[PDB]
């Protein structure tokens, strides 16, 4: 009754296929084959309400066939991952966002940015730069460490919250439009009837 | 589908039992027994629309039982008759109107005044007085001659017109009230929903 679908997009060697497994099975693997592309399902309890999460990790070889994007775009949330040592991954994330914008053709979609593997490795890309990019793009930024299991839950919860906010806004706007049309028609009917009553009373 | 009921009230020797018969059967009688009390039915075509008229002439002996007034008050139109030679009939008409006021308990009822037998007999009561009483009472006044068959049709048509006007006014007022209540409730709902939408938008 309450299911949300999320897609995780990143680059090569930036923590791909290492966050979903840690979130689901609570276990870590040092090496995994990137050729594996699989979907995961898990139930959660967020804000006192149970929910279902489907997670799809973008993997596999380079593909551009129309059937791939036809089977895709079913996602409702998008999480883009990056590390603090790949300007190449920065540019890849920018290009991926630019492409999904036009592919979905929706003005705004639930989008979150995640920085992985920060505590252990050396740190190069400035937090000021990361926050500036996040503020310029208009999407939340979250720092997550895969091996220590911190940040994933809050990032997923915030993405779900964004989805809920968008749905509520759409519903409220539609209802307001309907009520406004109601009011206009009733106003015209009342004006006509009152004018007729006045004209009839004037005769007698 | 369109039936109206009228009651004709007068006094002694003021043309009673002589207008209804002339209207219905198109014939005149010089003498009629006042003890006869009967009801008449007739179809008419007024303003291009067919209608049914039931006519009840107030006759018989003086009766004050509650059963009489229970069988009565079913009338929707009232026609009060008078001549130009009986101040007694004038006072009787005034008293009858005063009594039907409280008997019906309605603020206003379809009421017409008719002056009978005017061309032939000597003329005493002033037309200025008659018109002054009619204007003071707020009811139309019509001059009718029984033997020459003039005025009855127009008097009945005007009474029917008053009935139609009253019905139309009541319907229009009821419809306006219902529409206004609709308007109020819908406006409050719209205000609440718009406030909620603004509050939700302010967060994001």
């Amino acid at each position: 009754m309450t299911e949300y679908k999320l897609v995780v997009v990143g680059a090569c060697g930036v923590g791909k296929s290492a966050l979903t497994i840690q979130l689901i099975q609570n276990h870590f693997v040092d090496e995994y084959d990137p050729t594996i592309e699989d979907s995961y399902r898990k139930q959660v309890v967020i804000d006192g309400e149970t929910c279902l999460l489907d997670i799809l990790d973008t993997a596999g070889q380079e593909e551009y066939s129309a059937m791939r994007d036809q089977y895709m775009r079913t996602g409702e949330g998008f999480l883009c991952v990056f590390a603090i040592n790949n300007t190449k991954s920065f540019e890849d994330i920018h290009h991926y966002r630019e492409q999904i914008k036009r592919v979905k053709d929706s003005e705004d979609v639930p989008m979150v940015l995640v920085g992985n593997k920060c505590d252990l490795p050396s740190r190069t890309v400035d937090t000021k730069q990361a926050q500036d990019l996040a503020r310029s793009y208009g999407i939340p930024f979250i720092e997550t460490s895969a091996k220590t299991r911190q940040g994933v839950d809050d990032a997923f919860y915030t993405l779900v919250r964004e989805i809920r906010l968008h749905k509520e806004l759409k519903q409220l706007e539609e209802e307001l439009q309907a009520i406004e049309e109601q009011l206009a028609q009733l106003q015209w009917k009342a004006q006509a009837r009152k004018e007729k009553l006045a004209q009839l009373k004037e005769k007698l | 589908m369109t039936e109206y009921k009228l009651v004709v009230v007068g006094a002694c020797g003021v043309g009673k039992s002589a207008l209804t018969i002339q209207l219905i059967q198109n014939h005149f009688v010089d003498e009629y027994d006042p003890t006869i009390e009967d009801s008449y039915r007739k179809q008419v075509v007024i303003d291009g629309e067919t209608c049914l008229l039931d006519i009840l002439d107030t006759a018989g002996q003086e009766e004050y039982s509650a059963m009489r007034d229970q069988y009565m008050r079913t009338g929707e139109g009232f026609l009060c008759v008078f001549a130009i030679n009986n101040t007694k009939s004038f006072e009787d008409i005034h008293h009858y109107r005063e009594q039907i006021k409280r008997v019906k308990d309605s603020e206003d009822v379809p009421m017409v005044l008719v002056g009978n037998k005017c061309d032939l007999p000597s003329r005493t009561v002033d037309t200025k007085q008659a018109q002054d009483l009619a204007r003071s009472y707020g009811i139309p006044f019509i001059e009718t001659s029984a033997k020459t068959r003039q005025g009855v049709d127009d008097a009945f048509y005007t009474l029917v017109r008053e009935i139609r006007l009253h019905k139309e006014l009541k319907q229009l007022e009821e419809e306006l009230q219902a529409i206004e209540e609709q308007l109020a409730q819908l406006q409050w709902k719209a205000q609440a929903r718009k406030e909620k939408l603004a509050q939700l938008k302010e967060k994001l």
Partner: nanobody, 122 residues
Framework: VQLQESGGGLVQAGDSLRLSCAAS????????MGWFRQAPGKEREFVAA?????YYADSVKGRFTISRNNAKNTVYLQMNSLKPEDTAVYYC???????????????????WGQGTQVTVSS
């Protein structure tokens, strides 16, 4: 309570026609009016309506004209640049309920007329 129609017939393609629907029952100045159409073997489709603002169908937009005169309670439909695919039967409709009724709903109106035939040759 009664509506009368005039102007139907058979004409050629590309000409212009003008049809009239008059309400002769009683006062209809507080009653919205409109037009519906039906082809042989098809379903009812709303064409135009008179309300607070003019409402039009998607398939005939930009060509038809609807006029209302409250002096005699008449509604006129003027059609120009006519296409041959409009040969059908047209009905005049009116509304009387005080509560809200959908304008594009065929089942929300309560007063109907006899209807007229419009035919266009090749």
């Amino acid at each position: 309570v009664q509506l009368q129609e005039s102007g139907g017939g058979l004409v050629q393609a590309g000409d212009s026609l003008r049809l009239s629907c008059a309400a002769s029952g009683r006062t209809f100045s507080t009653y919205p009016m409109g037009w519906f159409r039906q082809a042989p073997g098809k379903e009812r489709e709303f064409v135009a309506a008179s309300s607070s603002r003019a409402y039009y169908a998607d398939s005939v937009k930009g060509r038809f004209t609807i006029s209302r005169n409250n002096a005699k309670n008449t509604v006129y439909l003027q059609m120009n640049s006519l296409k041959p695919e409009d040969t059908a039967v047209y009905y005049c409709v009116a509304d009387s309920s005080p509560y809200y009724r959908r304008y594009d709903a065929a089942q929300d109106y309560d007063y109907w007329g006899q209807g007229t035939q419009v035919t266009v040759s090749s």
